[PDB]
């Protein structure tokens, strides 16, 4: 019995669980053969994945470096201190001006921890509306329901895009803010094509005596590589995920100002007051022990984020996206805001006579990952009139500009085939669209032709995180 | 720079971050050479670690199987459905009576998601107090501050131990419940060495029209092996972590009743109301994209947890703990509650003339990782009067029983040397103890030879999750 | 002078409203003919009613004396300052240790304003349970619904009587307070025959670092005459109505500590922090303009409360109650707590085989105003087994020594006739009892006899606030 | 001494309390000698004062007519039922579509009871901003502090006037409402010279699924005489004081929709859901026993409100205000909105090169009661730019129109004297203005240049509620 269970523990994945090993091999094939245009998705390095799947997952280390509750954390302390040092180092942060918490398990909980730390329950947040490019962790309630728990435990009011220009309406946000008296404002989007006017946000915030939180989840990589202006120039607190633009493990970081804020009008020192509160909201407030395996992975990701290879990659992300937007517009498409400053494009399909659900379904059965997105001009939010697409994943594969021109041509083909399926559709709901899409074989023929072109094009490019040879699904 | 970054993506961790690779090798040596006594720690299988370190981390899959926001989740859906199937199977649960959520990132958020799903903000919870054996996710407030976030967003009142027996006082709890009118009662603890009376707690909850939440974080593996009564016999909602007794990756699960609750007196049948609320509280309520790599790992952990080797291992952790308790009684130490029914022994060190701090410091010097603890009888919070120690970690490596007697003997040697240092310290606070402990040349000699004995006993057993051979740190 | 109205503004209640003039004359006859035994009732002086009926009602005077919004409040300021001075004088209070707010419109809002001033929303209050003798303005919730709004905006838990003695159970109060951690404890009852142990309440509040609020609405007159221990000996804040035992107009007062709290056995100088908070919670917090007509009336009532006639009256209220309790016990009745220390008695009718509802109905048919009251042993709130009666009202009319012996005799007659009507009832519900009582002529004869005895007795005594000579309904 | 205390209760006010009798006689003289222009003020009839000063104050009657806790309420039930009937009649309301609660003690608590009945704590209210003509009981918070407890227990956001036009900006309210998602919107004002566009606010509330509360405190009289559009045409709930434009005693009423709301177009009848909630929020929720003396007074006021001479008086209030505004404009004053629809004008004194504080001080020393008021465009409040003036009080005394031309002329004289004192003001701060105004016998003798004119003009008019002959201070 005694050595049998020891061998069960050291047996590899292929011997103990063939079905999970096989699901992973299938997913490897799907990542190899597919166009990944979902801008929140990326391919994480083998280095990061080896650290994430290490024995660091075994150690319980409640607390912080040099103030832990459990013993035997000398090496875990080394890893977490190195992670903090490299985090401040990646975004060019003076350690006496800025502090960082790397224990946050993911983006949504990271924001909730900031709100719990800095706000009393029911205090007021403004953030970019979800159907306008905001995240659920900013707050969201419909006409009918509280969707995000941020809206349950705090009072949230959205600020919206200018419907005609597709940029954030800062004139309506400032007016809104004088009336609503928010204690914190979130500068951070998921589905926004442009760069925040952090200077204007800081002005609105210190007039309204408000906290400036930046959610740079979507662009964190870009600001580590200096290709887009750093929110750390103006923000009081910056949160991010570690796994999007930044391309590390699934996790989060909370940066905050520390040290001296200013001298006030009586000559006394005003000290920043976010470190203790954020650190305590994370633990023992809302989390327990940290995930030291993901902290090790994040430390490796942050070392990669400071290299010239990384800077090259993210200026490529930007250039690929500029050329992608040019191709999309020249093919006869409307972008909201009419271009991009970053890693994504939001296509407004309203003028082509089809919405985002039908286009997304056709694109997916052709192995091109996009996601339906609401657009300015949408009457509903349940019926999205747009499609969101991004570069970072395929660019990580080594896609360059010509390659995104081919992907735009295949997207054009997908939209036109989706228009043909809508014309021939035997109904008006989404189920009838999918019915005629899989009840006519002309459309299934053209779907497989598009899929075939996508797979032949994608397979030419390197696999990230594993080697093509030792795969299980080569054909 | 065209293909020059692809190799940086696929390079090994040793050639990527040599400093993190080295820190991991140090921690591997520490796990191999060390007496791991921390009862919330364990050694996870290579199969789990390989799945956690896979490319499953790359996919965004907001939502649930067959109802995701993004497409291309065929394989992620397979993994999550298999995880749910194996979760229900590991605890012998009728899929028509019990449902499971496997997306919860950790234990504290899992409980908070149950509260957010089933209670309005500021509704009332009863739970086991913290300094008697509770967890922070149950709530805690002293005369000064709200520490755990749960006491911020909900109204919490504790139930206490019978101060002479060391079991839960089921009467003071019933009385205080009639007065406090709680909406939910939490059964489950950390530093509590006994198993609960679920039947009486179901009776109290039925009387007070209250929700029975069982937190089985500390005993989850023990419940899956059938060696202790299943809380699923009487509980409405069961939360657990996946990392400790269950021996899987760092995560959590929420189980909830579904289907028929009872038939009301008007003839109508009433259905449970937990599934939709809990699933929505988890996402889109408080979390974002699921961590599919940890879900894959958890699926393989749960498959291991159904096997006879696993049942043998859990009966072994129980037997090792019984022998450890007896071997400590022979030395002459006090166990709080007068013994143990499970995997942990909380030694009551007050009546030996030394605290938890000094013994833990010396044990960490000797590569014997345990943790300071407060028992009923202490003087304050951070002056601890107990040591908590657990079998599951060392038992994972093949510790048998007589091996835990040698562990008890070396712990006795550690506490005796700690007494020798405390009596000879010129001062009375922890600082004078630590000063005199490592400016000695006599006690430092005894510490190095104890550590030598510890390493000699430890290194004999197999390394769990990696091979002894390619350890970059041999001796 | 240049008008089509003014005619109706200076016309008496004459033909301006014959129906209301008539209803007032009816109520005057009812106050003359009847036994008023409801212990919260009293007869107000003519001087108070004349001040309440003055043109002081016309002035808007938001704010406080010398700190008002509007001009022309020099005389209103005189009246409010005089009211405050006489309030502090009527309870023998040093103006440098106590302050008073006389703008609170009634008892329930007065308590709510104290909570709003001193507690954040959802902070914790303890108070005497309503079916055990508490008030709704202290909090009340059933198994299904929040009844009092104090329970909506604050978290309330009750303390109970010892159902064996009939006194407040201070032991279970102290215990449940240790668990519940209240910010404020209310010492105040309605249906309670005994005096508060303010010393023990002070000790509990000092232990829990909690605010002692005494709600002396029922005994304020008794406290003003000094014939009962003063809650100002121990309380942080004292609230009262102005219209019960104190015998003024319908209103309320909030008294609070001001100046030094204690040089404190641990450091700095602590000042009482209640004045500004309470004054601001009253206005501009929860009320608008003060009712200066009611404040003038209250000033007259407080002047009367300092006279020897008034002291005689209150010691008479106490003596009448002692003799009334003796007569009730000598006629075979059970009193809750077995007697009284104050102005009322709770008769426990359970041993006489009849409930409070049937006895109250029969007493009302006889023009004896009392009210059903729950007693220990009562299963539910719907069917009370006791009767509450008190002496302030009829004592105001000059009921002396043996007059409450006649009250006891006529109550005994009502109980015995009620038992006869219960025996002859066809059904078990109160509707069948009332049907028999009005529609069975046997009982009609004895009803007329006791009503006659009641009226012939009451009519002999002086009318309070009007002349018998000018009564539209004199016979 | 039972003959004493009896006599003390029946002694008149002039005998018991000469000091209060004297203060009332002083206030009578002040009501006789002066121009009352504060538009929230009025002179109550002797009829309602005699009912308010009646023995109805003595009866406790918690509950509602036909459902009281205490017996002996047959005549109080008559008065409350008559009050309800006459309330619904005086506003021409179908008793099967509207119900009324007449127990509410005053305006501020009446609104708080509506919020407590119809909203959960922390739910959202929109109301007219306080410096734009709103009331504190609709919510108010500054940069630093929460002023009204409505803003403590509920989440409040204001809507503003158009700063150029002086009408409510209904566009900006609709926009704000989309973003802020209010559960209730308040159509109601205290310093707003126009009638609400109730139809537009019905449209906004129907769009936002929001409750329309009208607060007609200032215009209830005008609505009762039918000389302005009735908010009941559109509101879900109407609140009012009883003591301003309506001219009754100090109290409040809550009207609400009851019965059928609409057919849900699925077949079902949906019923209005206000009556039970509001009635329970008033009692037992936030109040105790009703003030039956005030309810009797209100019944008399409501009977007067249905007479032709009442309609004449309210038509007169309107005509007097039109002529007052015309006189002010022909004398070169700036009125916010350029005129009036109702009983008041808000004069913008900044166009004459002075503020509201200086003009108010000079007017008060001349016995012209007005009040400083924020005009839209003020550089903050604290020093307001306007004076608020109204016609109901002096119109009650019989001021006809030519009389308000004299009022306008004497106000103009007061403003010009204040300008002369500002010219001589050595400094700019208000203390130097008061110093110059008192210490400069040129200005002191011109102040008596009016006051004398004002006093002679006021003395020529009838005293309301008392007799010129029986007055004490007749010289
Ligand atoms: C702007 C922004 N903030 C926060 C998050 C939260 O991410 P997660 O799903 O890891 O919780 C996201 C999503 O990735 C995001 O786009
Ligand atoms: C102790 C106590 N508090 C508060 C109140 C409420 O006073 P009111 O009915 O004037 O609102 C009462 C009623 O008499 C009372 O007895
Ligand atoms: C619009 C409005 N609401 C509420 C109130 C509150 O009145 P009170 O001072 O009687 O509380 C007023 C004042 O008269 C008012 O004008």
């Amino acid at each position: 019995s005694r050595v049998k269970w020891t061998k069960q523990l050291n047996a590899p994945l292929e011997e103990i669980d063939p079905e999970i090993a096989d699901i992973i091999e299938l997913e490897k094939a799907r990542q190899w053969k597919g166009f990944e245009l979902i801008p929140s998705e990326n391919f994480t390095s083998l280095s990061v994945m080896q650290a994430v799947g290490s024995v660091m997952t075994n150690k319980y280390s409640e607390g912080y470096p040099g103030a832990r509750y459990y013993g035997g954390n000398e090496y875990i302390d080394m890893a977490e201190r190195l992670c903090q040092k490299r985090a401040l180092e990646a975004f060019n942060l003076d350690p006496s001006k800025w502090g960082v918490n790397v224990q946050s398990l993911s983006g949504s909980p990271a924001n909730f921890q900031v709100y719990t730390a800095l706000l009393k329950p029911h205090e007021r947040i403004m953030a970019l509306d979800l159907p306008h490019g905001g995240h659920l962790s900013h707050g969201y309630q419909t006409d009918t329901k509280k969707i995000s728990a941020v809206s349950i435990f705090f009072e949230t009011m959205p600020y919206r895009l200018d419907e005609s220009t597709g940029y954030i309406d800062y004139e309506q946000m400032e007016k809104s803010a004088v009336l609503f008296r928010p204690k914190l404002i979130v500068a951070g989007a998921s589905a926004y094509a442009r760069v925040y006017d952090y200077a204007r946000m800081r002005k609105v915030c210190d007039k309204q005596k408000a906290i400036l939180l930046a959610d740079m989840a979507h662009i964190s990589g870009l600001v580590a590589a200096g290709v887009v202006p750093s929110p750390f120039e103006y923000a009081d607190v910056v949160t991010t995920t570690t796994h999007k633009s930044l391309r590390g493990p699934r996790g989060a970081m909370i940066f905050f100002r520390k040290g001296l804020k200013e001298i006030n009008k009586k000559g006394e020192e005003v000290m920043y007051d976010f470190e203790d509160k954020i650190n305590q909201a994370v633990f023992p407030g809302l989390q327990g022990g940290p995930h030291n395996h993901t902290i090790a992975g994040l430390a490796v990701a942050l070392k990669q984020a400071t290299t010239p290879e990384y800077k090259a990659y993210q200026e490529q992300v930007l250039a690929n996206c500029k050329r992608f937007s040019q191709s999309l517009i020249e093919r006869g498409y409307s972008l909201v805001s009419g271009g991009t400053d970053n890693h994504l494009v939001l296509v407004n399909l309203r003028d082509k006579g089809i919405d985002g659900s039908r286009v997304e379904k056709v694109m997916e059965l052709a192995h091109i990952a996009a996601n339906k997105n609401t657009v300015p001009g949408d009457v509903s939010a349940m019926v999205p009139g747009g499609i969101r697409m991004g570069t970072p994943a395929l660019t990580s594969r080594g896609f360059l500009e010509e390659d995104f021109v081919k992907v735009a041509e295949l997207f054009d083909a997908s939209v036109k085939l989706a228009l043909k399926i809508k014309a021939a559709s035997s109904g008006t709901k989404l189920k009838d669209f999918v019915a005629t899409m899989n009840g006519d074989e002309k459309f299934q023929s053209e779907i497989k032709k598009i899929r075939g072109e996508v797979e032949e094009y994608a397979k030419q490019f390197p696999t990230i995180g594993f080697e093509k040879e030792t795969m299980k699904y080569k054909n």
Side-chain angles (χ1 to χ4, degrees), chain A:
Chain A
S1 260
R2 151 208 72 265
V3 90
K4 177 165 172 68
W5 85 58
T6 94
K7 213 195 84 155
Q8 168 199 49
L9 294 184
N10 276 292
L13 181 62
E14 353 169 70
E15 146 162 17
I16 278 261
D17 202 350
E19 286 83 33
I20 288 294
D22 194 82
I23 290 166
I24 293 175
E25 285 299 334
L26 283 176
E27 175 63 23
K28 290 160 74 163
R30 192 198 56 83
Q31 294 187 3
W32 168 49
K33 298 189 311 185
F35 280 168
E36 292 279 4
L37 303 176
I38 303 233
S40 42
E41 286 189 333
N42 216 348
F43 298 110
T44 176
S45 68
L46 169 86
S47 7
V48 168
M49 295 194 304
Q50 289 174 341
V52 171
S54 75
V55 276
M56 303 289 282
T57 189
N58 285 342
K59 198 63 193 72
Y60 221 116
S61 60
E62 264 170 9
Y64 291 99
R68 307 272 194 195
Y69 295 172
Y70 298 165
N73 289 314
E74 198 183 47
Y75 307 123
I76 307 300
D77 283 353
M78 294 180 58
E80 189 172 345
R81 286 207 191 96
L82 178 50
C83 198
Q84 292 167 344
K85 198 177 187 63
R86 291 180 170 174
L88 298 170
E89 191 179 325
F91 304 95
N92 314 21
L93 301 190
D94 183 336
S96 75
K97 284 205 199 103
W98 287 92
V100 49
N101 192 296
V102 301
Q103 283 190 28
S104 183
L105 284 189
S106 225
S108 306
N111 284 335
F112 196 97
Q113 287 152 19
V114 167
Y115 309 142
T116 295
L118 305 183
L119 269 49
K120 291 162 198 313
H122 305 301
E123 291 194 327
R124 283 179 178 192
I125 297 174
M126 279 174 80
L128 176 61
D129 207 356
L130 203 182
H132 285 219
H135 191 261
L136 276 160
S137 67
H138 298 358
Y140 183 60
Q141 70 248 323
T142 39
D143 212 39
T144 139
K145 197 164 176 177
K146 300 270 196 81
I147 300 316
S148 162
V150 179
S151 294
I152 289 178
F153 297 110
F154 304 89
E155 293 299 318
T156 69
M157 197 179 87
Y159 65 82
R160 291 216 294 188
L161 293 175
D162 182 323
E163 208 114 275
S164 64
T165 70
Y167 289 67
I168 292 176
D169 198 352
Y170 299 95
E171 232 352 85
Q172 206 48 55
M173 163 187 143
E174 199 159 6
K175 303 181 80 53
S176 251
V178 309
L179 285 181
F180 182 65
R181 298 200 114 106
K183 283 299 105 220
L184 185 153
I185 305 172
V186 172
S190 47
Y192 191 52
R194 300 303 186 162
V195 76
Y196 261 89
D197 186 350
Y198 296 112
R200 176 70 116 95
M201 303 282 315
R202 145 80 28 232
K203 200 204 75 197
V204 167
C205 279
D206 31 44
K207 299 331 130 201
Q208 215 72 215
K209 309 279 182 158
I211 298 163
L212 182 49
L213 170 68
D215 184 18
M216 66 168 179
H218 261 249
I219 68 170
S220 49
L222 293 179
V223 322
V227 304
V228 302
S230 169
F232 293 86
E233 204 184 342
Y234 304 90
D236 288 312
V237 180
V238 181
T239 53
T240 188
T241 62
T242 57
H243 54 259
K244 297 192 179 190
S245 183
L246 189 86
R247 194 209 249 163
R250 292 192 166 268
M253 286 192 287
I254 315 169
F255 308 91
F256 40 85
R257 290 300 326 263
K258 68 191 279 195
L260 180 73
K261 185 183 216 297
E262 75 202 317
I263 279 78
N264 75 2
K265 288 176 82 182
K266 325 168 195 153
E268 294 156 271
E269 284 195 324
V270 182
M271 300 293 299
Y272 280 118
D273 186 7
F274 303 140
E275 217 196 354
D276 286 7
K277 290 184 171 179
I278 292 185
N279 283 328
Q280 292 173 39
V282 173
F283 171 85
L286 289 155
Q287 301 199 170
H291 291 185
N292 297 309
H293 61 295
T294 52
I295 297 171
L298 170 57
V300 178
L302 286 167
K303 193 258 158 57
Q304 294 180 33
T306 67
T307 74
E309 298 88 326
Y310 195 81
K311 182 170 190 157
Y313 159 69
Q314 243 134 37
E315 60 196 44
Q316 192 61 50
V317 169
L318 278 214
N320 289 350
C321 202
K322 281 298 198 188
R323 216 292 141 180
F324 186 51
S325 31
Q326 293 173 12
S327 295
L328 282 168
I329 295 189
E330 290 151 30
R331 294 183 181 277
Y333 286 121
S334 284
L335 312 193
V336 319
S337 73
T340 176
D341 282 321
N342 59 31
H343 67 287
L344 65 91
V345 296
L346 191 36
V347 173
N348 194 323
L349 300 169
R350 289 187 67 78
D351 61 357
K352 294 291 127 313
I354 200 171
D355 68 331
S357 23
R358 296 150 162 72
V359 169
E360 184 215 312
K361 297 232 182 289
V362 167
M363 287 182 67
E364 186 212 2
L365 258 62
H367 281 41
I368 308 175
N371 49 78
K372 47 176 143 263
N373 217 99
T374 32
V375 294
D378 268 321
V379 195
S380 180
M382 190 266 189
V383 195
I387 284 281
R388 192 210 321 169
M389 286 170 294
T391 69
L394 290 184
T395 301
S396 278
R397 301 273 293 276
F399 274 50
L400 311 172
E401 308 170 26
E402 263 200 11
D403 299 318
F404 271 104
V405 189
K406 189 71 189 197
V407 81
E409 180 60 27
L410 279 137
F411 165 76
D412 189 23
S414 330
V415 168
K416 263 137 209 182
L417 203 232
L419 270 163
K420 251 310 200 289
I421 306 170
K422 181 178 174 192
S425 75
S426 300
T428 314
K429 198 33 194 172
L430 183 59
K431 60 102 182 165
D432 285 311
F433 175 92
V434 185
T436 75
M437 176 197 200
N438 308 130
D440 177 78
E441 299 175 324
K442 323 158 171 290
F443 301 147
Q444 296 202 168
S445 176
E446 191 72 21
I447 282 164
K448 194 171 198 232
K449 167 204 141 199
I450 293 169
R451 181 170 48 172
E453 271 174 40
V454 170
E455 294 185 321
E456 177 195 349
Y457 204 101
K459 285 191 294 290
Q460 222 201 19
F461 292 83
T463 56
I464 293 81
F466 60 92
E467 289 304 350
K468 297 197 196 164
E469 295 71 22
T470 52
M471 288 184 58
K472 185 191 165 179
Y473 294 91
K474 63 155 88 173
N475 65 273

